């Protein structure tokens, strides 16, 4: 058995839209291998 936590309350944190772009075709393309951990949400044009 295990005793579990609970969700608190509707708390709203919105994200924001950053500005840069990238081209680089290698797998790391940043600091490490996976990409959806290291890609900025939704970027501005």
């Amino acid at each position: 058995t295990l005793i579990n936590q609970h969700i608190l309350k509707p708390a709203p944190p919105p994200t924001e839209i950053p500005a840069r772009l990238q081209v680089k075709p290698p797998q790391p393309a940043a600091m490490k291998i996976p990409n959806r951990p290291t890609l900025l949400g939704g970027s501005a044009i």
């Binding site: 058995t1 295990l2 579990n4 969700i7 708390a11 709203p12 944190p13 919105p14």
Partner: protein, 1012 residues
């Protein structure tokens, strides 16, 4: 009311728990058993839902380990076969019972497996029972082990992670479900991505995806370009069948759907000279989905005048194709959903379309015989036959509803329905076989009556014993090899049909199955027992206990298993185990009771064993295993050392121990059906329970739910079947009743008022000779007038009606003058039959005279309150039955005789019973008669002038109702009215003195002011 009752045990973890606790085992099982045989079965599932919701985190729920494997396999077997009746997601009620069973997950939840396929119905299509579905999934990940839980979910692991991934969405979606799902997909760590495999369900251009190309005409492109006219067909099907969107989208979805459908229909090339011709792959699953939404559009208002207009068009269209293909079928697959649908409008349009495929087919060719050689009428036979062999429950309902109209519209050539005789009945036995017992019985009720009525219909023609060669006997050899098996509805109707098959074409039933009776026996003898588990072991007996109910069959060698039986008797699964031994009684009870076979066996010690085992079963641990065993002994009555051996275990259970259960009591009552010292013994048995310290502790508990009362009443049941001597147990038994009510403080009712009465049915003379002696006493005679008023004392009422006037003599011969007891006695048997009251009149005034005597002593202020409620409620009971006499005769001059006889009491007679009875004599040349009688009886001035005034409610409401519902006094008495009151003399009303007489004189003034 169930909501009010079940929330009370959630309010009290207290003495309000054990009163509901034993009933809910019955209330669940009798709600499953009633839902298969109800008109609206869904309220029996709303009931258990408010039972499961109203408890939670409860006390033990220890009585759910036994009903759980039958409640799951009821719910999982009709979460498949249910598709939204009105449109309510009624599959989403079955899952909420399945997922919220109120038990512990540890030992009870194992075997839940049943819960994996309704797990994905709760996660995928739901809205807030998703949270119920995620809650049970979180419980079974962290508690269980990966070596146990992973092989459970393997069939639906690839389907739960598609519905779990639709919930991971940001803050516009819930923070409740999207954060719970992330915890479930993290708390199992590497077992997330162990299912990630190459996909298999690649949608390869399905039927509504089919790019059908209509040729358009646009202004830029100067040609006839084709476009797909199905980009909204996926949204057309889902809009037409939902009640939630507005009606304007639902009407436009039909014009889209019928718009595509008319482009398939009219594109077919018609014949050039069809009258001269008369003298001579992926589309076909799209059209069935298209034509079905046309059929559903009949159930919509304000468009069914248009959707019917082409349903009659296309059914006319699809028969001239086959009548032109005679030189060379999407309507039938569309009809069978209309027949098996839910609304009565779409179902009737299925019934109208099956007529129009025939009523136009007789219009086209005329000759019905050649309209069965190659016509489409012949192929809708084998469509209705084949879809009884289908998997789903609803397609079985189409072939059973479609066939019963196809035998009541094709009635004329019944010679066609004799070559297809065996193929229909074999198709109609099969629908009885693979139908679950928990589905509603509308598919089996129309299948049971259709085998029965048809064999009375097309088998009223067979001649004699000579024509029984191959064709009819193969029909008999089909429904006798289906005699021994389980699922008794195919076993009971194999005997109901074979009886009515041999009722018409009058042939003995033993001679009918005679040339194939040895083929049936050979499997049933081969493997004797200890194989063929307990569902089959009721079926092996049932073919033999029917076969010995014939005139003669198999007079030798059933004794190979007759030992086998006695020993299965001599030793849910517990349900079928007591169902097993209850049928071995009937095989053994028909072994001895039938003549000409008991003398055949009697050389090698057979009957003795049967009798002895029939005993030892008499002390069994159940109830219904004793009842059929009681029927076996009561049938062999038409030995003594075995009777003394049987009485030895009987008297051992009948020992003075005060621990006799109710199973031995009814077995004792069954024994006396087939000395008198037990009456001395059983009175002292109950008195151990009947000490007042066992009843004052009871005090105010309900008596029907109690368990110590059921031992008391089952003791009292035995006195119905005593030895027939002139019993002296009349006085002390009734003194045991009156003592038992006063220590319960419970008057006018008790559950042990009923078995006291069946004893009094046995002795009518000794009862009334006890009651008539102690008649002036109140507290024992109140129990008498309930016993007379009971319907079970039909022999006691005949005693008190014949010996009626001997209790009338008591009222002629001082505080014990019980007028009050006689009134409730005569009221109790006047409610028996309305025919007793019509002749008694000297009784009824003799009651009211001695009642008026009692209202002289009771009107006396010498003592404080002598108004005893036995006397005054004697009059309010006397008067409502004195009116029960009046509406049996039509005379309007007897009601004015009740008035002067009550002058010493209550003034105007009693309300709510007589003021609406004068109002039914007031509301015809008999209305003139009542006004003659009033002016007759009123100059009796000695009738106490508050009665003389009292005709103000009976004279003037006649005339002011006559002068309101008729014109003005349009309808004898006037010649007699003016005779006396307007020739009146001095002593009466024509004097002048201010007394209470002037209240009468206003009845005379206010009447003359209405005559003018």
């Amino acid at each position: 009311l169930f909501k009010l009752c079940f929330m009370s045990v959630s309010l009290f973890p207290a003495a309000n728990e054990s009163v509901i606790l034993p009933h809910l085992n019955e209330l669940i099982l009798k709600s499953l058993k009633l839902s298969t045989t109800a008109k609206e079965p869904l309220v029996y599932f709303y009931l258990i839902r408010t039972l499961f919701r109203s408890i939670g985190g409860g006390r033990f729920e220890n009585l759910y380990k036994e009903i759980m494997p039958l409640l799951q396999v009821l719910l999982e077997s009709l979460s498949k076969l249910i598709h939204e009746a009105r449109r309510p997601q009624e599959r989403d009620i079955y899952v909420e019972l399945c997922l919220t069973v109120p038990v512990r997950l540890s030992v009870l939840v194992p075997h839940l497996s049943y819960l994996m396929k309704p797990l994905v119905y709760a996660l995928n299509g739901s809205q807030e029972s998703v949270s119920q579905g995620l809650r049970t999934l979180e419980l079974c990940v962290d508690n269980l082990t990966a070596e146990y839980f992973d092989p459970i979910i393997e069939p639906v692991i690839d389907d739960v992670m598609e519905a779990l991934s639709k919930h991971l969405k940001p803050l516009p979606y819930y923070h409740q479900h999207s954060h719970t799902t992330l915890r479930i997909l993290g708390k199992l760590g590497g077992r997330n991505r162990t299912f990630i495999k190459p996909v298999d369900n690649l949608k390869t251009d399905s039927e509504l995806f089919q790019n059908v190309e209509a040729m358009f005409k646009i202004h830029g492109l100067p040609n006839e370009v084709p476009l797909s006219i199905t980009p909204g067909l996926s949204a057309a099907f889902s809009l037409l069948t939902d009640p939630r969107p507005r009606i304007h989208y639902r009407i436009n979805s039909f014009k889209y759907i019928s718009g595509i459908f008319q482009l398939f229909l009219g594109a077919t090339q018609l014949p050039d000279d069809y009258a001269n011709r008369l003298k001579e792959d992926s589309q076909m699953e799209l059209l069935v989905k298209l034509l079905e939404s046309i059929f559903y559009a009949v159930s919509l208002q304000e468009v069914r005048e248009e959707s019917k207009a082409l349903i009659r068009g296309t059914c006319n269209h699809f028969i001239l194709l086959y009548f032109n293909k005679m030189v060379i079928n999407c309507i039938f697959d569309a009809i069978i959903y209309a027949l098996s649908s839910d609304n009565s409008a779409v179902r009737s349009m299925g019934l109208e379309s099956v007529q129009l495929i025939y009523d136009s087919c007789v219009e086209l060719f005329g000759n019905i015989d050649c309209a069965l050689k190659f016509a489409p009428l012949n192929v809708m036979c084998s469509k209705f036959i084949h879809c009884c062999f289908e998997e789903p429950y609803h397609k079985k309902l189409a072939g059973c509803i479609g066939l019963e109209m196809m035998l009541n519209s094709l009635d004329i050539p019944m010679k066609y329905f004799n070559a297809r005789q065996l193929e229909i009945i074999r198709a109609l036995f099969y629908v009885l076989r693979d139908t679950a017992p928990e589905l509603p019985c509308e598919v089996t009720n129309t299948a049971k009556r259709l085998i029965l009525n048809s064999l009375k219909e097309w088998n009223k023609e067979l001649t004699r014993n000579d024509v029984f060669s191959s064709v009819f006997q193969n029909l008999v050899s089909s429904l006798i090899v289906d005699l021994p098996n389980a699922n008794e509805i195919v076993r009971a109707t194999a005997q109901e049909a074979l009886r009515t098959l041999s009722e018409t074409t009058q042939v003995p039933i033993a001679t009918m199955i005679s040339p194939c009776k040895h083929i049936l026996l050979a499997p049933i003898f081969g493997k004797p027992l200890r194989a063929l588990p307990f569902q089959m072991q009721i079926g092996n007996i049932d073919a033999i206990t029917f076969c010995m109910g014939l005139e003669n069959s198999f007079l030798e060698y059933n004794e190979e298993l007759n030992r086998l039986v006695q020993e299965a008797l001599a030793l849910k699964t517990s349900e079928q185990l007591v169902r097993l031994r209850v049928v071995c009684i009937q095989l053994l009870s028909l072994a001895i009771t039938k003549p000409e076979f008991a003398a055949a066996q009697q050389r090698s010690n057979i009957r003795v064993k049967i009798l002895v085992v029939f005993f030892k079963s008499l002390c069994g641990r159940s109830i219904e295993i004793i009842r059929a065993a009681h029927g076996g002994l009561k049938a062999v009555i038409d030995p003594k050392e075995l009777l003394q051996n049987g009485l030895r275990p009987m008297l051992m259970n009948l020992s003075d121990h005060k621990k006799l259960t109710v199973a031995s009591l009814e077995a004792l009552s069954g024994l006396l059906k087939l000395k008198v010292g037990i009456g001395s013994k059983l009175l002292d048995h109950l008195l151990a329970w009947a000490q007042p310290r066992t009843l004052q502790q009871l005090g105010s508990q309900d008596l029907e739910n109690n368990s110590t009362v059921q031992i008391i009443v089952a003791i009292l049941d035995v006195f119905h079947l005593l030895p027939p001597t002139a019993h002296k147990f009349m006085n002390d038994l009734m003194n045991a009743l009156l003592y038992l009510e006063n220590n319960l403080h419970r008057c006018q009712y008790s559950p042990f008022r009923e078995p006291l009465a069946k004893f009094l049915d046995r002795f009518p003379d000794e009862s009334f000779e006890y009651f008539f002696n102690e008649f002036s006493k109140r507290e024992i005679t109140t129990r008498f007038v309930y016993f007379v008023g009971l319907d079970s004392c039909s022999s006691l009422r005949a005693k008190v009606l014949e010996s009626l006037p001997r209790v009338r003599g008591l009222l002629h011969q001082e505080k014990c003058v019980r007028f009050s007891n006689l009134v409730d006695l005569c009221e109790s048997l006047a409610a028996s039959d309305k025919e007793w009251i019509k002749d008694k009149e000297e009784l009824l005034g003799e009651l009211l005279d001695a009642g008026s005597v009692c209202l002289t002593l009771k009107r006396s202020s010498n003592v404080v309150s002598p108004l005893y409620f036995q006397v005054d409620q004697g009059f309010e009971t006397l008067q409502l039955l004195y009116i029960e006499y009046f509406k049996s005769q039509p005379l309007g001059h007897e009601k004015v005789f009740n008035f002067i006889d009550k002058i010493s009491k209550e003034g105007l007679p009693f309300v709510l019973e007589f003021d609406d009875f004068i109002f039914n004599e007031v509301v015809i040349p008999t209305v003139q008669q009542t006004l003659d009688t009033i002016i007759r009886m009123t100059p009796q001035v000695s009738s106490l002038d508050a009665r003389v005034y009292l005709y103000k409610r009976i004279f003037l409401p006649i005339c002011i109702y006559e002068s309101e519902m008729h014109g003005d006094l349009s309808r004898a008495w006037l010649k007699s009215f003016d005779s006396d009151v307007w020739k009146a003399t001095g002593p009466l009303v024509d004097d002048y003195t201010s007394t209470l007489e002037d209240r009468y004189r206003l009845e005379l003034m206010q009447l003359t002011a209405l005559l003018i």
